[PDB]
Amino acid sequence: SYTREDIIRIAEEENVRFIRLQFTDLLGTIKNVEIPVSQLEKALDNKMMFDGSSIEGYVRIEESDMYLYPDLDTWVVFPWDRVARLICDIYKPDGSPFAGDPRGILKRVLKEAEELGYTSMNVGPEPEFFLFKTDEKGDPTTELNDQGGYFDLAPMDLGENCRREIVLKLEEMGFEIEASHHEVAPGQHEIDFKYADAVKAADQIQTFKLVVKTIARQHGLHATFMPKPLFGVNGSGMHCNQSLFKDNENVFYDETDELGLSQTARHYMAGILKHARAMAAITNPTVNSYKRLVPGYEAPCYVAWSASNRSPMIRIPASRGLSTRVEVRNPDPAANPYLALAVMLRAGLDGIKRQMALPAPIDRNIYVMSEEERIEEGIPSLPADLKEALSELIRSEVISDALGDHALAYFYELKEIEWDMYRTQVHQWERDQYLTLY
Amino acid sequence: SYTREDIIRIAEEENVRFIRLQFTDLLGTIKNVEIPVSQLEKALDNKMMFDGSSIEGYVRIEESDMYLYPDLDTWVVFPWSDRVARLICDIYKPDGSPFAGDPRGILKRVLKEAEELGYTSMNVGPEPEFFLFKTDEKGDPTTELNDQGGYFDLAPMDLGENCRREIVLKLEEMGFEIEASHHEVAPGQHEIDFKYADAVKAADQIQTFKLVVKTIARQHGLHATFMPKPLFGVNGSGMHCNQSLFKDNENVFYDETDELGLSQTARHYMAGILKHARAMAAITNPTVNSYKRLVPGYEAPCYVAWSASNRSPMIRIPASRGLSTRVEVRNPDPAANPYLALAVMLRAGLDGIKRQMALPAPIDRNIYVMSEEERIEEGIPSLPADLKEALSELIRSEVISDALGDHALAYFYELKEIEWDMYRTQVHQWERDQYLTLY
Amino acid sequence: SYTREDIIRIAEEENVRFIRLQFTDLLGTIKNVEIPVSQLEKALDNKMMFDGSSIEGYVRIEESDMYLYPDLDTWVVFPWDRVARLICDIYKPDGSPFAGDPRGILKRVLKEAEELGYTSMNVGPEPEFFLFKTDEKGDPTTELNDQGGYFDLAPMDLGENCRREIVLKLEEMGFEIEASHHEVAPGQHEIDFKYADAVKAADQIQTFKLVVKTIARQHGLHATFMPKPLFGVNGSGMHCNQSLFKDNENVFYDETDELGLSQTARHYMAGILKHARAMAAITNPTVNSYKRLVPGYEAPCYVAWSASNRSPMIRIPASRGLSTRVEVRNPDPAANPYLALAVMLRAGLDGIKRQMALPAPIDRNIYVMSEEERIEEGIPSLPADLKEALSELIRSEVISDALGDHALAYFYELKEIEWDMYRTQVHQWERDQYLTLY
Ligand SMILES: Nc1ncnc2c1ncn2[C@@H]1O[C@H](COP(=O)(O)OP(=O)(O)O)[C@@H](O)[C@H]1O
Ligand SMILES: Nc1ncnc2c1ncn2[C@@H]1O[C@H](COP(=O)(O)OP(=O)(O)O)[C@@H](O)[C@H]1O
Ligand SMILES: Nc1ncnc2c1ncn2[C@@H]1O[C@H](COP(=O)(O)OP(=O)(O)O)[C@@H](O)[C@H]1O
Ligand SMILES: C[S@](=O)(CC[C@H](N)C(=O)O)=NP(=O)(O)O
Ligand SMILES: C[S@](=O)(CC[C@H](N)C(=O)O)=NP(=O)(O)O
Ligand SMILES: C[S@](=O)(CC[C@H](N)C(=O)O)=NP(=O)(O)O
Ligand SMILES: [Mg+2]
Ligand SMILES: [Mg+2]
Ligand SMILES: [Mg+2]
Ligand SMILES: [Mg+2]
Ligand SMILES: [Mg+2]
Ligand SMILES: [Mg+2]
Ligand SMILES: [Mg+2]
Ligand SMILES: [Mg+2]
Ligand SMILES: [Mg+2]
């Protein structure tokens, strides 16, 4: 790991002139202040301050002073006067860590895993995105960047150059990129990168979204991670591939098993399934998230698992060994990555600690099953809208405890205001259906 | 009470050349075929047919032949060239039995349950509010309301005076007893009140009222709508259903010894309305948009409660006594099928009487500003928050399900489940505005 | 006076098909419901009801039922199926008169005058108005109907036909019209009518405004009684000419006096002056009212009186006998006529009852006096804005008592919301002055 002295040294060597101190609000939005390198020693002394009452989910105006403590291992130089980055943890002025810090929330849950002997939670996220064209002014239009489809080539796929420049920038920043391709829906794109320990994976999701939007704009496009920008075509998921490790060993892997899944893996999966409905408000946190969780678009809407199957909530991909993993498919890229990893880890650990029995897999296209069949086989549904998910979240002591009292209370208040504003709108669909009929 | 010979005579007297045979589909939409007067004897002979598979909620393509039996007492000439009259018809199957899914037959069935308990009439006074929108050169509505006036305003703040006045003149030529007309609370919103009538006639008059309003509004270059909530942030349109039971000429809801003038029968009736309020919401508030009106702060109900002279609760008792003593059920909106709405409210009320239900305490506050904590304290239930929740309550209610009958219930549920599922998968512009640049 | 039986009879004789039951909200806005003549007997039985929670200043949603009791002497037929009118008083369902009814408030103050022996308060109001052109859609533009001036003729004055049709309609409705002319500002107009007892004068102001706006629209124009629609030109006043009578005798008249003013007249004037600042919130009730009360436009802004002088708050016109009167010039036509007459009568009566000493007149152009001179002669200012006027209103027990507790509390709450909304706006003037300067 880097020391204080290492950062000073490297900042001079690479001639860094500016440093961004970055952190994440409750809703997952990245935030930063930029300081000249003359201030780097002040920043490393943990003395930078900000207004916590202007950051969503943090504190109130009457006790608004908060501090940034940089995590020196997050040091990296931006490719696009040299600018560098430090991701920071949030502290109160009395020196204690801030309970509502999403990154601290993940670290707290990860300590629970370490005490059970798991040295790391490895996470490979797949944050899909759409690219929209922009007008003369630079705002997004309703027109997608192309009308291509899954694995298409140019000129059907017009995202090749934009995705490739994203990849080159991510690689200069230390990402191990695995693949790049057009996704199923028009104007939809995917760039995959190697799994990493959970905190780093969530840091990389934040950085990934930032690089994607920055490069998209240089190409005259607008990138969005909105879960379902368009009816009738695929939405964008952020599948969270997960495994637990003991130093070097993927403990989810058992070569004697049919699917390569250890008993620990199956208990973990059972925990994800058990608490699926209760974590949905965190993994699928917008009104629009539930427009993606509709049947027929390779997004889940029922609580089930199956191997090599893209209809259920959990897929077990058809590979084994170090790549043995649980693919939880319901999160979308609007989820706060720190909170989403935290609640899924706590749900998985509860499954392990209580040795929860794994339900039988649903080895079929779950979308074409009737409600009758779903009831016969005891297949629950994911929540149908944000309000229902929120009601399940507050009733869950396991998921509530993951979040802690502060984030839970702020998250619920924000989302109840969001839902009440949505629910009272009169949408154009209603005018089209009813204005001339009634 | 008109005979066939009366209708023949009157059509000649008035020089009627065409007759509309009118009826109502399951969702409340009026339907008709127009016949020349040369065909009137065939129509009075109950021989007119139609395709029941093309009328929402009736029958399937493989069993699609259906008959119209005119109700002779619904005869009226339209006042607005070659004279046109109408008859409202009941729906019959080719074997001669009345169609189980006919909304007008459904209300008549429930009314017979009232008659056997001694009540000779259910008197109903509906207040169907509506908006007037301007139209473009092609005649379709724009987003602009006809005016920006408000409650009881005068011209030129209220620009609907002439349109409302001509509606009133046409309705009175058609035998309506008009009581009042005024601008309502929201911009471009209007109200025309007419005297209560027995339930079937009241529902027939609701169907006729909506037709005349839309026809005259179009003559004035406007588009009338009974959509419950066309615009966020201003009042929606309700159809308050004022209700009383009579024994020949006596209003059995009236008791002068009572502080509000309500008899014990009225109080039991109200208790049945409140008991079944959530279960009949899908009928009285049958669209997705209905539930954007059932939000607090706009004189539409949100919570299941009653109060005197209070416009915040579900039931208001107006500060009138005597023949005008009544129960104002405020939650229906003018998208409700009037025959089905009256049928389920009547059934709920009668169930409250047969079971001698205890009437909850009144909520004598602005219920909108009560905290959720206070509302649980008093045990005030909520109306369903959306159409899907309303449908779930409907199919679980034996009392409301049996008001509708097996046929209408099954078709209503199938239609509305499809409607809900279509709405719930849409991505609305609000979502793009909130999320496309934030995420 | 008319009886119930008289109204039924006349309604049949003149073939009236519809009746408007009219009344006035707290802010002076006329309101009505239209009933078919079949309902006339119900209306005369005092059984018509309305939602008092939708009428500004009346009652709350939880006790919203209110009743209309028509005043049979207000019967009149509209000129423009015959429609008639009845002005109504407001009652609660328990049968008591509604304390917040502006017309009942005036009648209550008038009872105070009758007990002192004055049989009527005669009031001649001069409600000036502007006419604006309208667009293709019918909304007002910024363009006035003409660019004429005081007493101008066509084609400089383009309001002649519109004013003349207003006059003809008012005369068919029983008005005694006295004069019609273009006023000082472009597009500004005046129609005068004979004084009447106070309640009738206020009824006639309501009817006058309605006829003016109706006929203006038939001519493709928009009439407004806004006090000051345009900077730098005259605003619109509603001068309230006032006198007290004993049966037939103008008690303000004394032929032995220099100005023809009785001692009663001078005490009344002293009361108006004493409470000028305290009644301003009622006589000048909008934010815009105080844009008219600026110097140089024949509107008052200082508390003073003078004969044949159009600079002060009170003018004594140069005529005597039955036309001896006190012209209170500060009210504008946005004032509720019932409340405005009520507070000025109560102020005048307080002057009589306390035999208040009349200050010396200010026989000069008061606009060109320096602040120093104004202080030397003890000339107070009218309030500078609505907020200051409201603060003076609540501190006045004489004017507060005129209004009664209900109207006072609703009026203050409405106007404090109005003022707080105005005071936080950022106006274009501020952008023009400061956006490029700072
Ligand atoms: N043991 C593991 N634990 C967690 N993630 C893993 C593991 N092995 C591989 N992954 C990651 O899972 C993700 C798979 O993404 P992708 O190749 O898009 O899969 P698919 O499209 O089949 O879902 C990659 O980020 C990959 O690095
Ligand atoms: N006994 C009664 N039963 C049913 N309806 C009645 C009865 N008495 C009056 N009504 C009706 O109730 C309705 C009241 O409507 P409206 O006058 O708009 O009342 P509000 O606006 O006060 O709710 C009218 O249709 C009236 O005829
Ligand atoms: N004794 C009186 N009391 C009240 N008003 C009066 C009396 N005599 C005349 N008036 C009225 O005063 C008003 C004078 O208006 P106007 O002729 O426009 O006067 P000016 O333009 O000079 O102010 C008229 O309504 C007139 O009828
Ligand atoms: C072909 S897809 O299966 C698309 C998934 C969809 N966009 C969703 O999760 O909403 N995803 P993957 O990258 O896992 O193969
Ligand atoms: C003033 S209002 O109270 C408006 C009610 C509202 N439009 C609704 O029921 O949605 N109705 P009413 O005619 O009963 O007085
Ligand atoms: C010439 S004017 O003096 C105009 C008065 C001005 N409009 C005002 O009172 O604001 N009025 P009047 O009709 O009294 O002669
Ligand atoms: Mg993938
Ligand atoms: Mg994918
Ligand atoms: Mg995947
Ligand atoms: Mg009404
Ligand atoms: Mg109404
Ligand atoms: Mg009503
Ligand atoms: Mg004048
Ligand atoms: Mg003048
Ligand atoms: Mg004057």
Automatic annotation (TrEMBL), chains A, C:
Amino-acid positions noted as binding ADP in the UniProt annotation, renumbered to this chain: E178, F193, Y195, S243, R315, L322
GO cellular component: cytoplasm
Co-factor remark: Binds 2 Mg(2+) ions per subunit.
Residues that coordinate or bind Mg(2+) 3: E126, H239, E327
UniProt binding sites for L-glutamine 1: E128, Y150, G235, H239, R292, E298
InterPro entries, A to Z: Gln_synt_N, Gln_synt_N_sf, Gln_synth/guanido_kin_cat_dom, Gln_synth_cat_dom, Gln_synth_gly_rich_site, Gln_synth_I, Gln_synth_N_conserv_site
PROSITE patterns xref list: GLNA_1, GLNA_ATP, GS_BETA_GRASP, GS_CATALYTIC
GO terms under biological process: glutamine biosynthetic process
Binding site for Mg(2+) 4: E126, E327
This enzyme's EC code(s): 6.3.1.2
Positions contributing to Mg(2+) 2 binding: E126, E190, D192
Main localization (coarse): cytoplasm
PTM-bearing positions, type O-AMP-tyrosine: Y367
Annotated SUPFAM superfamilies: Glutamine synthetase, N-terminal domain (SSF54368), Glutamine synthetase/guanido kinase (SSF55931)
Necessary cofactors: Mg(2+)
Residues engaged in binding Mg(2+) 1: E126, E128, E183, E190, H239, E327
Residues that bind L-glutamate: N234, G235, R292, E298, R310, R329
Family, as annotated: Belongs to the glutamine synthetase family.
NCBIfam families: GlnA
Protein name: Glutamine synthetase
Species: Paenibacillus polymyxa
Lineage: Bacteria, Bacillati, Bacillota, Bacilli, Bacillales
Automatic annotation (TrEMBL), chain B:
Keywords annotated in UniProt: ATP-binding, Cytoplasm, Ligase, Magnesium, Metal-binding, Nucleotide-binding, Phosphoprotein
GO annotations of cellular component type: cytoplasm
Keyword Transferase among record annotations: no
This enzyme's EC code(s): 6.3.1.2
Signal sequence extent: none
Annotated binding of L-glutamine 2, by residue: E129, G236, H240, R293
Domain of life: Bacteria
Biological processes, Gene Ontology terms: glutamine biosynthetic process
Reactions that this protein is recorded to catalyse: L-glutamate + NH4(+) + ATP = L-glutamine + ADP + phosphate + H(+)
Binding site for Mg(2+) 1: E127, E129, E184, E191, H240, E328
Residues with the O-AMP-tyrosine modification: Y368
Protein name: Glutamine synthetase
Organism the protein comes from: Paenibacillus polymyxa
Name of the coding gene: glnA2
